[model samples]
Target: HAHLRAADPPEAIVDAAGLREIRLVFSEPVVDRFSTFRAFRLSLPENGIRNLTQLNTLASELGVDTEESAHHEVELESDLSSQSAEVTLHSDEPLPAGAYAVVWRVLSVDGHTTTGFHAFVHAGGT
Candidate 1:
């Protein structure tokens, strides 16, 4: 069981001038060990077909190293009740213009794991 809150640069956002970081808040505390976060650059379609399969290739396709550097760097802030947690991803550099998806897999305190993707489009240049 998982719920998303306060995702910075919010879902499906457009015209994000200069994005530098990503933050995700959950209704419950999530463990650090198996949690993972990744970002991908959505490429254009070819021959009238979108290559959605590219996302499956981290090394040969998709975006650069926000995931490589920050995958293991997910920071968590939990309160006394342990009923909520904030996950933050710090980027080494500002993000460029394009369609992107933040994919994540996280295990909550209740022994259940949740994973999904949050997408956004930035309209500015590098």
Candidate 2:
């Protein structure tokens, strides 16, 4: 099964202007067709991402303000042929400074399903 080897923005990436692409690398090759990647911006209080349940609560479509484009459902394209997938945020709208999470679930070669998320902050600008 594929175990995460590396992640661009590396878990705690610090302005993050082009809070756009999310790259995940695995120790083993993974299938891209059935894999999933999604990013959601927030509108939350002190309590935030703890688990999928909390994540779901704050990461709801309503939590993210503005247009529909705020929620990204991008293509999970493998960058390293099969060991890595980079999901791009295709929307052109500038994200307002806040915390966000990219939830990913990939199917490994061994038929294992790996699901995890990393939270990152976008510090708007100067």
For model 1, residues 1-126, the per-residue Cα lDDT tens digits are 666666876754467566667778877777777566666655544532233344333323323234445332323232223334787776667777766677767778888988766666566664
Across residues 12-126, which tens digit of lDDT does each residue of candidate 2 receive? 5266675555666677767766666666665556764455456444544332222446554333333434444344333345555666665667788788887766656665542
Cα-lDDT of candidate 2? 0.56
RMSD after CA superposition, every candidate: 6.5, 6.1
As for candidate 1, its clashing pairs are: none
The number of the candidate with the highest TM-score is: 1
Off by over 4 Å in 2: 46-95
**Top candidate (lDDT):** 1
At residue 40, candidate 2 shows an lDDT of 62
Error of 2 at 88 (Å): 5.7
As a whole number from 0 to 100, the lDDT of residue 58 in candidate 2 is 54
Candidate 2 lDDT for residue 56: 49
Alpha carbon lDDT at 37, candidate 2? 60
